[PDB]
Structures are given as structure tokens and as C-alpha cells.
Design a protein around this ligand. Structure first.
Ligand SMILES: *[P@@](=O)(CCCCCCCC)OC[C@@H](COC(=O)NCCCCCCCC)OC(=O)NCCCCCCCC
Ligand SMILES: [Ca+2]
Length: 320
């Protein structure tokens, strides 16, 4: 009905871990997001990359995105695009910004583990306690096969062990060295960087935000316990019609006990921080961020469809 989200450059929504554009070709990762933006006069494109893989490397997700960004420009007549990444997606959008500045006009990250995930360190530490190392073989085989069965194009390019390593606190620290951005502040500071970036003479408008439903609220005998601020305590229906609200609150407790502090379930506040931080106050878990698990969210959670809508308006008034 409107031209509210009518940006100058086309929007490309980049998925994260486990993702694709539509699971099994039916479940949209960005639930009703592309549609909502379309109605409001925006040109939106949703990337289909590997659900399980690293961002760098010839056969990585970054190159899959560059290739896709290229075809979009070839299909739109555009010169640059607006990368909007979620989770590993923001880490993937960054790669294209770095390696191909001219084709990128802005990078926006939604709950992106720029410094990594403490939960990725955990899951890997749990894999290492198998002295034989067969858990890593069989669980990766399993998770890769999920990638293929739920990818809309049944993409065989899945490396689960690469995807889990890419997301660890220590490996992301190497990523940032190898792919520096002006929107990144010093490692270990829980501080962001500059709002814009300039590579090869090309200006990118850097933005980001975070979900912080899981806050640490009680420390007893060393053991830290958290609260899911997205929900009305106990009686909230989101804990019923959404298995991820409670799953993320479980992963979110493992996080606080590993020093993450306030997090969205799998990403910390400190790790999500990039460029221009518009908010970290959202009472959202990791999926609420993408209006995920059939449009369901707790009662104290803001409308994520509205947030990505006000942002596309912000990109428009920004000149991108
Ligand atoms: P980001 O890319 C990476 C965040 C860092 C996390 C590392 C986990 C280590 C392997 O985000 C991508 C995903 C995150 O998905 C989740 O964490 N889901 C919670 C798993 C939870 C379980 C805890 C049980 C605890 C007792 O964002 C999503 O994939 N989104 C989509 C919903 C997809 C539903 C698909 C159904 C397919 C039948
Ligand atoms: Ca949810």
C-alpha cells in the first residue's frame, strides 16, 4: 500500500545457521518479513545459501552470497545492495562488504555473533569429551543431512563441524582479524565501532541490533540462573505454541553460566554489537528476531516485523 520501505538499493535478507530461504521449501526463515517489506514498496530478495558451513573459504557461504548479490544486480539493474543479515548471516554479509565493497551499500546485523557464541564453545567442548571422536563424525553427518533435507534446493554443500567452529568465541576472533570492519570495536570491550565504513572508496552504512530476552537474574552457589524477559512469567502462551521460546531459554542459561551475560539464547549482547547499534533492549530471543516459529513471540516482545520495517525506512532516509 505504501512506499515506506522503498529503499534505493535492493534488500537482501541473509540467513544464519541451519537456514535457507524456506525450510523444505515451505517454512520461511524470515517469516512474513519479505512480504511485509514488499507491500510497503520495497524490492526484497532472500538468499539461499548453505545452512551449515563457514563464511570464508572457496566453498563457503560468503562466496555463495557474492554470487547471489551479483545475479540480483543483474536482475534489478542496480549497482549496490542492502545486506540485512541475521545470526551467521551478518558474518556473511560482512564478507561480501569486505571482498566486494562496490556492490554493497549497507550491512545490517540482527543478533550476529561477531565475537562468537559461548554456546558454540560449549557444544564443541561436549564433542571433545568423546575420546574416540565418533560423536563428531556421526552428529555432523546427521546435521549435514538435515541441511540437505531442509534446504529448498537440497544443497549438498554442508559442513556442520565448520559451521560450529566458525561460531566459537576463539574462531570468530580470527575471522575479525582476517576481515576487519570499522563497525567493530576492540576485542573484549563490549563496545561497537563506527556507524559507517569506507572500503576502496565505497561508503557502507553499518547498523545492528540485539535480542536480550535472557538476562542473568539470580546467582546462588556459583550457578547463575536467568529469566526470559520476553514472556509473562510462567502463564505466557509463547511457551506453548513455540518450542523455541523455552529451548532458547535453556541454551540461554548455558550462556550466562559461561560469562555471556544478557543474550538472546545463543548470541550475547557484546557479540551482537556492530556499527550503529539501534537497540539491544528488545525482549527477544534468537528467533523472535526473525518473527520466527510461525509469528509467535512473548507478550513483552516488540513486533520484529515492525522493527525491520522502520529500518528499511531508515535506510531510505539514509540515501541507501
Ligand atoms: P545463528 O546463525 C548462529 C548463532 C550461534 C549458535 C550456535 C549453536 C551451535 C551449533 O542463528 C541461526 C539459527 C539458530 O537456531 C538455534 O539455536 N535453535 C535453538 C536450538 C535449540 C535447542 C536447545 C534444547 C535445549 C535443552 O536461527 C534459526 O535457525 N532459525 C529457524 C527456525 C527453524 C525451524 C526449522 C524447523 C525445520 C523442521
Ligand atoms: Ca518465538
Amino acid at each position: 500500500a505504501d512506499n515506506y520501505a522503498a529503499t534505493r538499493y535492493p534488500i537482501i535478507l541473509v540467513h544464519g545457521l541451519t537456514g535457507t530461504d524456506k525450510y523444505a521449501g515451505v517454512l520461511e526463515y524470515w517469516y512474513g518479513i519479505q512480504e511485509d517489506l514488499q507491500q510497503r514498496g520495497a524490492t526484497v530478495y532472500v538468499a539461499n545459501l548453505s545452512g551449515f558451513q563457514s563464511d570464508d573459504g572457496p566453498n563457503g557461504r560468503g562466496e555463495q552470497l557474492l554470487a547471489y548479490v551479483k545475479t540480483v544486480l543483474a536482475a534489478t539493474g542496480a549497482t549496490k545492495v542492502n545486506l540485512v543479515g541475521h545470526s551467521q548471516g551478518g558474518l556473511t554479509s560482512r564478507y561480501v562488504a569486505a571482498v566486494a565493497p562496490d556492490l554493497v551499500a549497507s550491512v545490517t546485523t540482527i543478533g550476529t555473533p561477531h565475537r562468537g557464541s559461548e554456546f558454540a564453545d560449549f557444544v564443541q567442548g561436549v564433542l571433545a569429551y568423546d575420546p574416540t571422536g565418533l560423536s563428531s563424525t556421526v552428529i555432523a553427518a546427521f546435521v549435514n543431512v538435515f541441511g540437505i533435507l531442509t534446504s529448498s534446493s537440497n544443497n549438498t554443500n554442508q559442513d556442520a563441524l565448520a559451521a560450529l567452529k566458525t561460531l566459537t568465541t576463539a574462531q570468530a576472533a580470527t575471522y575479525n582479524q582476517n576481515y576487519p570492519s570499522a563497525g567493530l570495536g576492540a576485542p573484549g570491550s563490549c563496545q561497537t565501532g563506527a556507524p559507517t565504513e569506507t572500503v576502496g572508496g565505497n561508503t557502507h552504512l553499518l547498523y545492528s541490533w540485539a535480542g536480550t530476552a535472557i538476562q542473568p537474574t539470580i546467582s546462588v552457589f556459583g550457578v547463575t540462573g536467568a529469566t526470559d524477559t520476553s514472556t509473562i512469567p510462567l502463564v505466557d502462551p509463547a511457551n506453548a505454541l513455540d518450542p523455541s521460546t523455552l529451548a532458547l531459554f535453556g541454551t540461554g542459561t548455558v550462556m550466562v553460566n559461561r560469562g555471556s551475560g544478557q543474550n538472546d539464547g545463543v548470541v550475547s549482547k557484546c557479540s551482537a554489537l556492530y556499527g550503529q547499534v539501534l537497540s539491544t533492549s528488545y525482549k527477544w530471543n534468537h528467533l523472535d528476531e526473525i518473527n520466527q516459529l510461525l509469528g509467535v513471540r512473548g507478550a513483552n516482545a516488540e513486533d520484529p516485523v515492525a522493527v525491520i520495517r522502520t529500518h528499511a525506512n531508515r535506510l531510505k532516509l539514509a540515501g541507501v
